[PDB]
Amino acid sequence: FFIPLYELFLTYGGIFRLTFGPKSFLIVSDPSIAKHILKDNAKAYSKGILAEILDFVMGKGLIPADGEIWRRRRRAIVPALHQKYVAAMISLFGEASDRLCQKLDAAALKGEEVEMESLFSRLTLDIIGKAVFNYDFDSLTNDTGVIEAVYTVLREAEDRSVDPIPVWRKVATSLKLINDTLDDLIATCKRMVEEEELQFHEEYMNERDPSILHFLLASGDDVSSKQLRDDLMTMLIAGHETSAAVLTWTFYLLTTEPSVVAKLQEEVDSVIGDRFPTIQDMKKLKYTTRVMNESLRLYPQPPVLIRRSIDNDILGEYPIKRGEDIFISVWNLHRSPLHWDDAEKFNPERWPLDGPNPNETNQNFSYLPFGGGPRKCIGDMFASFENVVAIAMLIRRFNFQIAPGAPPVKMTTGATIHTTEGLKLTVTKRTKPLDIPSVPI
Numbered sequence: 001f002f003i004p005l006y007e008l009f010l011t012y013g014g015i016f017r018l019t020f021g022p023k024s025f026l027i028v029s030d031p032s033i034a035k036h037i038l039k040d041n042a043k044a045y046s047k048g049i050l051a052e053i054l055d056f057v058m059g060k061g062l063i064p065a066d067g068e069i070w071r072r073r074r075r076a077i078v079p080a081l082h083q084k085y086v087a088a089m090i091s092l093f094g095e096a097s098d099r100l101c102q103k104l105d106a107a108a109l110k111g112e113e114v115e116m117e118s119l120f121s122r123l124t125l126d127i128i129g130k131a132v133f134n135y136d137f138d139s140l141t142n143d144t145g146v147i148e149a150v151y152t153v154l155r156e157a158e159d160r161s162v163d164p165i166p167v168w169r170k171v172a173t174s175l176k177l178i179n180d181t182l183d184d185l186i187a188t189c190k191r192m193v194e195e196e197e198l199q200f201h202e203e204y205m206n207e208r209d210p211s212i213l214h215f216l217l218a219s220g221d222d223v224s225s226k227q228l229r230d231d232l233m234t235m236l237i238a239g240h241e242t243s244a245a246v247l248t249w250t251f252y253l254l255t256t257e258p259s260v261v262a263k264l265q266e267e268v269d270s271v272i273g274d275r276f277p278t279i280q281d282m283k284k285l286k287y288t289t290r291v292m293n294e295s296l297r298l299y300p301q302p303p304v305l306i307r308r309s310i311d312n313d314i315l316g317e318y319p320i321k322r323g324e325d326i327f328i329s330v331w332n333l334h335r336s337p338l339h340w341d342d343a344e345k346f347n348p349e350r351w352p353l354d355g356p357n358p359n360e361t362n363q364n365f366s367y368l369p370f371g372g373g374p375r376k377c378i379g380d381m382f383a384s385f386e387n388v389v390a391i392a393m394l395i396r397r398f399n400f401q402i403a404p405g406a407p408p409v410k411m412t413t414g415a416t417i418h419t420t421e422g423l424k425l426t427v428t429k430r431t432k433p434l435d436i437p438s439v440p441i
């Protein structure tokens with residue numbers, strides 16, 4: 001959908017009306033206009049179509065919500081992602097990534113090729129399930145009805161994402177299994193909170209169940225079980241398929257630039273060796289961060305942000321009324337030749353390696369990996385570190401190349417940019433099994 005919008009943005013500019021019959025979208029590719037919609041005048045907008053897409057699974061979760069219900073739930077959930085909790089989650093990122101490395105090691109020894117997209121999906125599902133509501137999917141190793149239920153739901157969400165866009169049964173069961181499973185976790189976590197002796201503060205975290213579900217229950221907001229299930233469900237959907245795509249496209253991009261891989265291997269060998277990364281390593285893995293930054297620029301998740309005007313406004317210098325469906329093309333902002341040198345080149349050092357990490361503010365909204373304004377992603381640090389940990393640990397241990405005769409790598413976008421047929425790679429060990437673990441300082 002958004003691929004033709006790139007050339008149309010080159011011809012017709014930062015804001016234009018895509019009409020298809022009697023319906024139309026406003027297509028925004030101007031960083032100034034994006035900043036006006038996302039941050040300066042955000043009160044004039046709702047999530048619009050986005051809610052119609054995600055409502056069946058996310059209910060009253062943060063992403064599709066607006067108004068006071070959004071404001072109250074945002075204020076309750078954001079404290080759960082404090083620095084100590086993010087620091088603890090980094091251990092989880094290292095454990096789960098290590099379980100993936102073990103699979104790649106097994107395949108490497110047998111000369112087997114690996115389809116990385118499906119594995120990255122299993123890895124990021126295993127991470128998000130433990131981090132949010134203390135569930136161990138173990139989708140890296142096994143398949144369960146719970147796991148199959150999640151993917152059924154994700155397939156339906158992708159269908160609802162493509163449905164309102166012009167081109168030029170088992171769901172209800174999967175929802176019931178996920179919701180009942182959440183109920184059991186909520187129940188189990190309630191007993192644990194009733195029995196503990198911990199005092200609640202701004203950095204509250206039970207070291208045995210550091211999940212977001214546990215923080216919320218120990219805070220005592222006392223909302224409905226549906227509202228809590230939907231908040232957890234929303235974060236489960238948000239934190240999963242986004243990073244799965246980020247890792248997939250990162251490693252694809254690494255196949256296209258062997259000089260970046262040498263630079264990345266050099267950093268990871270020197271900074272972490274065989275270690276599980278820690279919070280202190282997140283600042284030290286500069287080039288790894290830039291590689292993630294540049295991957296999210298080349299392949300944003302999602303490529304498009306969705307709003308609907310609920311009041312009069314001026315976009316660029318065109319007046320609009322309420323009721324306009326707006327699609328901010330993050331893809332166009334990220335690749336705009338106006339605002340990027342060699343915009344199609346994979347170049348992690350396009351931001352100075354020792355300068356500030358890029359965000360929507362210092363890039364003046366030409367770069368929105370996590371959005372902007374009041375609706376900005378609350379998991380931006382969570383996911384930023386999750387992906388740095390995965391990249392570093394994988395690159396330390398293996399060399400990846402496009403597999404011979406692998407299917408082509410094409411984009412199939414619903415809510416995230418998936419590939420058409422996977423990312424088939426040959427994986428080769430960089431360290432020998434009989435080598436003593438290398439711990440650098």
Ligand code: HEM
Nearest residue numbers: 062063235238239242243301370371375377378379382383
């Ligand atoms: C690479 C990974 C991720 C990317 C690229 C990403 C991207 C985004 C973006 C662009 C938005 C803004 C959407 C909009 O303005 O309509 C958003 C919102 C949100 N994200 Fe993330 N996300 C990621 C991971 C996560 C994780 C790990 C969590 C865990 C809690 C999470 C939870 C949320 C929530 C709850 C919102 C809604 C916030 C609100 O509306 O107040 N996301 N995400």
Ligand SMILES: CC1=C(/C=C/C(C)=C/C=C/C(C)=C/C=O)C(C)(C)CCC1
Nearest residue numbers: 001002053063161237238302304414415
């Ligand atoms: C907001 C949001 C999400 C959903 C995005 C959707 C639903 C995108 C649909 C885009 C379309 C219609 C693209 C057409 O080309 C995620 C990924 C669940 C989590 C992160 C933020």
